[PDB]
Symmetry: C2
Subunit: 99 residues, 2 copies
Amino acid sequence: NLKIVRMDRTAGCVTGGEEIMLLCDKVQKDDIQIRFYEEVWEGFGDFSPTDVHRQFAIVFKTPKYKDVNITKPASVFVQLRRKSDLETSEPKPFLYYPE
Amino acid sequence: NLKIVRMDRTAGCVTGGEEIMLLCDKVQKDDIQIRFYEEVWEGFGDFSPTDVHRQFAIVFKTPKYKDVNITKPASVFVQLRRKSDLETSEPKPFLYYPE
């Protein structure tokens, strides 16, 4: 089902709050989340249902990473996840960089 | 009809070739173009029908501006335009900056 077709940024500042545009196959705006994770730390993209564009894109802000004092980049994953039954997309790599 | 709902960048290097993601209301992938213009200079976003995502977003590269030697930013407009009958969206401002 779920798929991240493209993201306009695959890296971001460890403090979060940076806007990313993600293109996806069809989602339900009230039953979708963006999960960043590291094998388990997790953080979620910050957006509401109105930031989902006609079920095929999402504009959101990055979560803060677990350690804002990293000295070198921290490799994580990002997936779509349906809130209702926790079905997921295949993950995309994402790099957090030191502030 | 046509509408640019959001763009991930509203500025770009005067040399062009920079990837932008634009969210739009429904378009036909074979009958859509992105027109940058200045009152008339015009340039077009570089993309093919496959870069249009399920009729609701477009990933494209910026055109080169008419003068790559500008010393200060050059304010232009960007609109969607249907190739067949030249119907347009309302324009969005866009700033080209010196290299």
